[PDB]
Amino acid sequence: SHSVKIYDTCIGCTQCVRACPTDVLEMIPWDGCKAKQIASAPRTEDCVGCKRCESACPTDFLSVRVYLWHETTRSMGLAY
Amino acid sequence: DISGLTPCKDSKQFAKREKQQIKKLESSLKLYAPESAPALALNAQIEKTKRRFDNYGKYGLLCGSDGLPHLIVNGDQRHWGEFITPGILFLYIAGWIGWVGRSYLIAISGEKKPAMKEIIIDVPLASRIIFRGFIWPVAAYREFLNGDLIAK
Amino acid sequence: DPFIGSLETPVTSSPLIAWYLSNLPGYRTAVNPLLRGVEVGLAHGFFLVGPFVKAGPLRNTAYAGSAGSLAAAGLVVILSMCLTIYGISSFKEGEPSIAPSLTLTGRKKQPDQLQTADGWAKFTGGFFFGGISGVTWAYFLLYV
Amino acid sequence: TPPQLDPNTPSPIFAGSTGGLLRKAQVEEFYVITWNSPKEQIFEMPTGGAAIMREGPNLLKLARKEQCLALGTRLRSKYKITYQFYRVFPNGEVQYLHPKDGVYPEKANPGREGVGLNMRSIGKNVSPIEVKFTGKQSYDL
Amino acid sequence: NNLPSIFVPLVGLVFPAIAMASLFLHIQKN
Amino acid sequence: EVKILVDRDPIKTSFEEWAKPGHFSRTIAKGPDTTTWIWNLHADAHDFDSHTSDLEEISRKVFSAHFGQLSIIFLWLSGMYFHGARFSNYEAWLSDPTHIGPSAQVVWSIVGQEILNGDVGGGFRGIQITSGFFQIWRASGITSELQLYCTAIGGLVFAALMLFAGWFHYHKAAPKLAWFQDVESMLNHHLAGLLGLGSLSWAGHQVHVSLPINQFLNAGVDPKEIPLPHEFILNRDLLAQLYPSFAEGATPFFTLNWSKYAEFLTFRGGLDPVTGGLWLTDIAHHHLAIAILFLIAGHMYRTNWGIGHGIKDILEAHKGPFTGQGHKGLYEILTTSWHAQLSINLAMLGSLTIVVAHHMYSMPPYPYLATDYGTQLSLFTHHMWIGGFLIVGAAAHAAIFMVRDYDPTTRYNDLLDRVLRHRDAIISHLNWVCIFLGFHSFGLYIHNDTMSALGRPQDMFSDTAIQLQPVFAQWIQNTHALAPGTTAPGATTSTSLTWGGGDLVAVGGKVALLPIPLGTADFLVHHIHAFTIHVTVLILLKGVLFARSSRLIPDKANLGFRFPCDGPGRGGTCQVSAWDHVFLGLFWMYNAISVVIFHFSWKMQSDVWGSISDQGVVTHITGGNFAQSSITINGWLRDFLWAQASQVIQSYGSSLSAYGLFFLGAHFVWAFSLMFLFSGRGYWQELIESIVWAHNKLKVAPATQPRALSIVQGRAVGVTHYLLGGIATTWAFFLARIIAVG
Amino acid sequence: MFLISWRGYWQELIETLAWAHERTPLANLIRWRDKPVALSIVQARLVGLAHFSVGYIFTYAAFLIASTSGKFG
Amino acid sequence: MRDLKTYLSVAPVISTLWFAALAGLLIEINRLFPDALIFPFF
Ligand code: CLA
Ligand code: CLA
Ligand code: CLA
Ligand code: CLA
Ligand code: CLA
Ligand SMILES: CC1=C(/C=C/C(C)=C/C=C/C(C)=C/C=C/C=C(C)/C=C/C=C(C)/C=C/C2=C(C)CCCC2(C)C)C(C)(C)CCC1
Ligand SMILES: CC1=C(/C=C/C(C)=C/C=C/C(C)=C/C=C/C=C(C)/C=C/C=C(C)/C=C/C2=C(C)CCCC2(C)C)C(C)(C)CCC1
Ligand SMILES: CC1=C(C/C=C(\C)CCC[C@H](C)CCC[C@H](C)CCCC(C)C)C(=O)c2ccccc2C1=O
């Protein structure tokens, strides 16, 4: 299972949550931004590594980071 | 004279090469009629070859053992025209081009969207800028002395 | 079931094809694996005898067929090895069979014991014996 | 939200294909997606070909979660239909998978616990030399 | 003598088979 | 019903849209932020389907582009004719075609390139051409240069007319959508009008102009003494002296006693001994028959009247054992999108071009064409390459249609769904076939090489040790040889001399044609051809079928048609789009065509071409070493690549030197392509960062920030350079060899 | 081959081959223990580099030794 | 006239005009002086 981390530079535009193809990220209430929300990655075990969340993130550098890690049946995208 | 090289007028292989070229040209020349245009063209080619060899002999180059001219880039005063003078001319031309380009870039940097000026050049401004390159060394030296050449 | 990754075609589902495939020794579930392996090895060795003696390096000399026969036997040995290890890495000592439990209709049937350590061991032994016997029979019939 | 159940829902009209379930479904797991349609219409299956969804409740079996989510997002985008999918294990356990709180992830919901949050800039991570000879990683700290 | 006729087949064929079988069994072992 | 529908002044002609680049797309029209903008401006220029969504504008743009292409083609033809008229030795070559090499280009005398003016012959110096235009002009009856000048002027006029027509049909009167969607009338006019009438007129020209002039030339008359072509029309006495049937006039044609025209409408076949080509009477007869057939076949579809057939009715009312209801909604699909039609036409045109090359090399239709080897080689290779490229493009357009124009709700077809529902079996079977064919075909060669390298020539697959003969091809050859005796009583001889059986034909001391033997080598090369074709088909079909979705990626259609990948996840998803499949199949098409042309060249040089002495012995160019040296890879490398490259590398200082230079230059380009195929974008971007810093230090930073090329752009550049380098290398080698030795 | 063609094509081909192996009779009795997958990116790059280097070295060594030993001068 | 002049100032057109003029000048210079290997004026 890969590792997905979220930093505090997020502005809560909800693009990463919409971009995820396996329902890994969601949004929670927060306090330190105008949008009053921040993303989170509870369902880490379902990540495949497509890095679409990093593709859709407006910041100087990404506030969501994906590090590849130990692979399994789910992360390898195998249907057989 | 230098590095065991022979002056090109003295060397015999130079004349041998000229003889081979003339014979090769005449071999094809013999086919066509004397009044035909190909004969005139081949005669002009022969005259050009003779003139080229005469000029190469006159200019004082040094053929090697194989009979072909060699170039000396040492800086010896007897061979300054082979390398040094064309080098100075090339440096002058390249400095002209670079100075003109940099001046145009700095001139168009002022506007709000210089990209549209780069993709679509404006002709009057470039025409005004181009002729300032005739004095590029003086301007470059003065800008270096002042301190406007290098960005800070 | 339309949502299973398989299609129904005249070739894959016909009474003749079904009968012919179910009567093959590799699909007889009730029979113990040794008798199936013996037949499989006999057929495989009898088939394998030919090409070695017909296209061998010495095929033009007088020794040819004999040499070819020997080569065939050697191949069988290698094949037997390729079976034995396949058992050791697949089936444990105490685990039960892993064959499908229910038939196409839906009736519950006894799983095949071929997918077991003892079953595979019997199959390999029968295959080796049958292959050697078939190679010997083919050589004797061809050059006597 | 309380997880629901899918006792006896029928299935859409399909002619069959070779893109269906494989040995992993019998051995490891598979997924089940259920939705509700107001009228009978033709849609495109993720495995190739077209199928027809009966009016009322519909149920489908797939191999991976990505196919389920793609079909669900296509349904929501085009037909404006609510859907939900579960994961099924060989032993018979059924686990509710799609929206766990009852609301879609893109909508902020109170009472949600935050996981994987680092209260620093991405450039404040320590060098790999500081975490050497230990089982941790720089981004984990 | 005739050592090559005994040693070349051994190294060429038997030893690779033994090593391959041992390595396959060790890899597949749980 | 069928009607003419147009719109008046849909667009206004002005230069305001010329000033602003990229007006077609708003994103491009916004302005250049980085350099990538420029690279986009040329990529989306011709993608009319993405500029808008209305079919009418797309159809009008397509029509105008067709008109512009026709104008360009007419300009090219006019230029060729003008070069033939002015700078050429056509009149000298006409009298002595065997001993004079054609030439139609003259090089200036600026630098020293005057060595390129070789001694072609006939008191002329220039570059020898291999286009085969001189044979066409001779077969047309042209015996002067004024006619060529007039033809060039007419070509210029027609090009101007085509350009004006394009402008008029885009900016003044543009047809509506219903005009383009009338396929029955278009088919009727293309069959009866474009094809039948043109061939009928050409047959009339051949009957009235080409045959008498060619007969006079073949008799031995000087070209300057032949009567002008209009004299034959004006003077019936001359034609009566030549062909007495004309004395009867057109009365026999209406009298149905057509046998009287047997003098200039024959069915003999074979090659003409004097010129080594097909009989002109046979060509005129064939054109007349083809005109009749096309005129009859052009009245099949119902347009504006009761009689006729409906294409939709024919498709829908089709019932068969394996098909069933089948073709129900194909008419709407074919009449809705341009990409399906483009793919079908591209594939058909490629196949037709390959067939054209084969039929042209087999039976030479022009006089003094078989004995000119360079022309034959150039025509064969050029047509093969064009056909391969078209066949490749067909699959790409099919994938484009399947990606962006396919919806199963509004327009549903049963056959397409059935095919899409079992793609795995098709792909698996094709993969197995490719693996089996490749294994056998290449293992035969590797076994031959190994057996020959070990001093065992009796264990190879050759004509002497283990024979694998093409029995079916030999049976077909024997049947064709025996065909005119009993099966085709009308023909005096067989259609071609290729069939085993008959006599040898040679013109002017050089062999024209003789029967071609078939052995083990032909078997092996044919199987290699089949293997390569199967692999290319597998690649293209896998690209087409899995375009919409796949087991790995269930939503590939949302990403589009041209995307690099999906990400580093799932183990890696590089090159999953259909564009990558086409880019990969280009390489295999190149490989297959190269193998085919190599086989053709070596076989023709070894077994057919040659010279004949007075005694009657035939000496071939390479002395028949194909049957024993082409069974191993070492033989292919030594007896073909090493032996036949002597001429190209030794051409320095002669009139062929240019070819040698190309033989080097192409090589360079090939190596250059590797730089774009082995690397990635990140390294180049990181290097450009430091270069940009060094620029920034001296205040020469451009507003358009430099950016490295995109992944798709890099792949396209690499494949383009690879193909160009390989093709240019083969071109230079072939031309140098066939000009220096033949 | 390893230096131009990339992973997705081969992954789809492997999936199709796995389906073909699973569906056939008399060969579905034999089953694998490790799921077959296509090579990784870095692994494929390494394999291509190794092939390139081996071919380079062997070809040049053969040419040099043969040319220098044929004449012995 | 304004739009035509603006179009004529685009990069490819100006580039092709400049390079055609340069090529013509170089060709004419090489024609007037056929061969040149060293600078002989000094
Ligand atoms: C590394 C060492 C090696 C050695 C020593 C051999 C040795 C031999 N090879 Mg093999 N081979 C090798 C590697 C090697 N190979 C590789 C890497 C390849 C792949 C290219 C091949 C592919 C190959 C082919 C394609 C052929 C051979 C054949 C031969 C035989 C040639 C002698 C003869 O003329 O026939 C004398 C006659 C014989 C048939 C010998 C019969 C007795 C043999 C040795 C069997 C003894 C049986 C025994 C039970 C073997 C199994 C035990 C197991 C541990 C190996 C001989 C057994 C030929 C052959 O065997 O014919 C079918 C042949 O056609 N080899
Ligand atoms: C790829 C194709 C290929 C083929 C077909 C051959 C073929 C041949 N090789 Mg060569 N060879 C090849 C490539 C190939 N080679 C390569 C790549 C190398 C390495 C450089 C060599 C090196 C080599 C050596 C060193 C030798 C040969 C020799 C031979 C012969 C030995 C045959 C034999 O003993 O075993 C045949 C064994 C079999 C078990 C046959 C299996 C195939 C059966 C018939 C399957 C057919 C399937 C059937 C239709 C299934 C339908 C089922 C249905 C009924 C339900 C044979 C003519 C030997 C020689 O001396 O010959 C003169 C020899 O010594 N080969
Ligand atoms: C019998 C008359 C007729 C003729 C001769 C043609 C001939 C042609 N059509 Mg077709 N067409 C016709 C009827 C006809 N059409 C009708 C009724 C329709 C409407 C259903 C169409 C719809 C149509 C389309 C939509 C397109 C064509 C295209 C083409 C051209 C194909 C290019 C090529 O193959 O090179 C052959 C090259 C030559 C023979 C050039 C010779 C020039 C010809 C003789 C021009 C005269 C043709 C015109 C119909 C008559 C003038 C009428 C006008 C003055 C009032 C070719 C000029 C394609 C094309 O290239 O577009 C330009 C194209 O895109 N046609
Ligand atoms: C019969 C005519 C034909 C037509 C009308 C089209 C039409 C179309 N194609 Mg298709 N295509 C064809 C044949 C055709 N194709 C063939 C034969 C192939 C196989 C190679 C393809 C493969 C293909 C691909 C791979 C793609 C298309 C796409 C497109 C669209 C974009 C066109 C574009 O922007 O290019 C404008 C022009 C260029 C970019 C010029 C590029 C420079 C070329 C490659 C250089 C050739 C150099 C020259 C021969 C050598 C001399 C060098 C000298 C200059 C120094 C357009 C609708 C593109 C698309 O996006 O579709 C949606 C797309 O991606 N086509
Ligand atoms: C010359 C080098 C080369 C070779 C040999 C191959 C080989 C192959 N390619 Mg690749 N390829 C290459 C370069 C090469 N490619 C390049 C430059 C590209 C451009 C990116 C591609 C892109 C590509 C694509 C896009 C595809 C392939 C596919 C294939 C396979 C075709 C099926 C088949 O013929 O297998 C039969 C086997 C052979 C021809 C290989 C040689 C085997 C010989 C006979 C030796 C056998 C001897 C023996 C068994 C060895 C044992 C010795 C050992 C025990 C020590 C095959 C593995 C196709 C595929 O995989 O589909 C099936 C496919 O779709 N290739
Ligand atoms: C080469 C060329 C050219 C030229 C061309 C030409 C010169 C053409 C011509 C053409 C022509 C010149 C044509 C014609 C046609 C004709 C026709 C098409 C006709 C028809 C007819 C008919 C159809 C008839 C009918 C009838 C009958 C059947 C019977 C009786 C009655 C009648 C008579 C009615 C150009 C420069 C352009 C361009 C480049 C190339
Ligand atoms: C392949 C190809 C080519 C070629 C082409 C060609 C060669 C073409 C031709 C074409 C042609 C050759 C055409 C023709 C046409 C014709 C027509 C179109 C006609 C018409 C006619 C008419 C219209 C008539 C009318 C009339 C009269 C006048 C009289 C009587 C009545 C009537 C009404 C019938 C090239 C090289 C370019 C390249 C690309 C490809
Ligand atoms: C070499 C290379 C580059 C670098 C290539 C670049 C930057 C292309 C440069 C093209 C030209 C030479 C740049 C300048 C173009 C202007 C028209 C110049 C105008 C000035 C005068 C010459 C007129 C990549 O960006 C790349 C990306 C992805 C995979 C492989 C590669 C790759 O191999």
Numbering used by the authors:
A (entry chain C): 2 to 81
B (entry chain F): 68 to 219
C (entry chain L): 130 to 273
D (entry chain D): 64 to 204
E (entry chain I): 5 to 34
F (entry chain A): 9 to 750
G (entry chain B): 662 to 734
H (entry chain J): 1 to 42
What does the paper say about this structure?
PSs share a common structure that includes a core complex housing the reaction centers (RC) where charge separation reactions occur and an antenna system (Light Harvesting Complexes (LHC) enhancing the light‐absorbing cross‐section of the complexes (Pan et al., 2020)). The red‐most PSI absorption arises from special Chl pairs that absorb at lower energies than RC P700, referred to as ‘red Chl forms’ or simply ‘red forms’ (RF; Croce & Van Amerongen, 2013). In higher plants, LHCI binds the PSI core complex as functional heterodimers: Lhca1‐Lhca4 and Lhca2‐Lhca3, both of which exhibit similar spectral properties and emit far‐red fluorescence at c. We obtained two high‐resolution structures of the PSI‐LHCI supercomplexes from A. thaliana wild‐type (WT) and the a603‐NH mutant genotype, which lacks RF.
The structure of the individual subunits and the positioning of the chromophores within the AtPSI‐LHCI WT supercomplex were very similar to those observed in other land plants (Qin et al., 2015; Mazor et al., 2017; Iwai et al., 2024; Nelson, 2024). Structural models of PSI‐LHCI reveal a chromophore cluster comprising three Chls – Chl a603, Chl a609, and Chl a615 – and two xanthophylls (Xan) – violaxanthin (Vio) in site L2 and a lutein (Lut; Qin et al., 2015). Notably, Chl a615 is present only in the Lhca3 and Lhca4 subunits – the red‐shifted subunits – while it is absent in all other LHC proteins, regardless of whether they serve PSI or PSII. Chl a615 was coordinated by His168 and His151 from helix C in Lhca3 and Lhca4, respectively. An additional Xan molecule (Lut) was located close to Chl a615 in Lhca4 only, as previously observed also in the pea PSI‐LHCI structure (Qin et al., 2015). The Lut was situated at the interface between Lhca1 and Lhca4, in contact with both subunits, and one of its hydroxyl groups formed a hydrogen bond with the carbonyl oxygen of Ser210 in Lhca1. Notably, the EC value between Chl a615 and Chl a609 was 79 cm−1 for Lhca3, whereas it dropped to 19 cm−1 in Lhca4 due to the differing orientation of the chlorin ring in relation to Chl a609. The pattern from the WT yielded both monomers and dimers of Lhcas, while only monomers were observed in both Chl a615 mutant lines. It is worth noting that Chl a615 was localized at the interface between Lhca subunits in both Lhca2‐Lhca3 and Lhca1‐Lhca4 subunits, consistent with the hypothesis of its role in the stabilization of LHCI dimers and the binding to PSI core complex. Furthermore, while the EC values between the Chl pairs were in the limited range of 87 cm−1 and 101 cm−1 for all Lhca, the EC values for the WT Chl a603–Vio L2 coupling were significantly higher for Lhca3 and Lhca4 than for Lhca1 and Lhca2, which do not show red‐shifted absorption. We can therefore conclude that the lowest exciton state of WT Lhca4, responsible for the red forms, is a mixture of exciton and CT states, with a larger component of the a603 → a609 CT.
